Subunit: 112 residues, 4 copies
């Protein structure tokens, strides 16, 4: 037969190997739950950063449109003022032509 | 000699043409002043139109960036929730395995 | 003590519960692997959808900037052609006025 | 009577004062044509400048979108490659745990 000695032996080893596999499995559990955690934390963290990058960009754009809106209205205001001064200057001039034609008019008319 | 009659005639005509060429010039002055004004009025007007068009536009761009900013933060919030629920559901599950491995461990390791 | 029948019994029950726990653990493994796959799949999918949505958007912005740039150059082209017509219409008119003043100039200048 | 002398005198002055007003008016004419020209030239020129400023802007904006589109698709590719690697690493680790239960399974299921 096998003998009481060598039966006890193998069973001891046998239960040893078992309890070894199990405790790994349980280690692997804890690492798995750990990797999951740190990875979820990392994910959320980066994502946050994406959310802020994209925001800070949109701010930069917002303000850029405002400055451009501003510059644009000011250009056209400026145009406004120019058309105004070219009008005025011509008018002053043409009416001085006209006042001087009236001079020439009334005099021929009033003697005649 | 050219006669007193034909002298008087030529002068009369000669002085009429002059008063004619003058009163045109004066008419022509009033028209230039009038055209100048109308056309400054118009120019300003269209310019104003251009001004508002661009604003009302930039307004459309502004609100469009808001909508998209909203949709973007909200997408990423969603991702947030998902990652989270995927961390919880794995955790629960793995921790179940673990406590069930512990059940197996104590047992071997207390008859041992 | 227990008798042959009650040890054989307990051991049978004992090895059964064990195999019952192991095999759940093995089922729970397969579920875990399956869930992690289906969930990587859907996450990638949604991501993709995010990718194309943002793209489809930027496309819409690109072409909007093009149509507006277009309208703007054409607007200013218009301004150009208007300034040019008001310049021409005034020139024609003044040079008439002028050519007629010359009519009157040479007249006196030539008799005197 | 006023004497042939002081009649010749008045007429001389009278005609002088006329050819004087009529030559100013004619100068005033060509100055009007000159002023309107250089001011058409100036107006067109600034306008041209406005035209090109708006373009070089819209050109800066366009390239800015391209770069953001680029950064965005790369971020998400990145996310892609991450999800994949986390999927991979769990998978290895779980099917490993599995095979280990399969070692434990067949053992009982062949001695039994």
């Amino acid at each position: 037969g096998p003998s009481g000695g060598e039966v006890a032996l193998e069973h001891k080893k046998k239960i040893q190997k078992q309890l070894e596999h199990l405790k790994k499995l349980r280690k692997s559990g804890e690492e798995q739950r750990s990797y999951g955690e740190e990875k979820a934390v990392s994910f959320l963290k980066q994502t946050e950063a994406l959310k802020q990058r994209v925001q800070r960009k949109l701010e930069q754009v917002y303000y850029f449109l405002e400055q451009q809106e501003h510059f644009f209205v000011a250009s056209l205001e400026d145009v406004g003022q120019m058309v105004g001064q070219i009008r005025k200057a011509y008018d002053t001039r043409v009416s001085q032509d006209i006042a001087l034609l009236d001079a020439l008019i009334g005099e021929l008319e009033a003697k005649e």
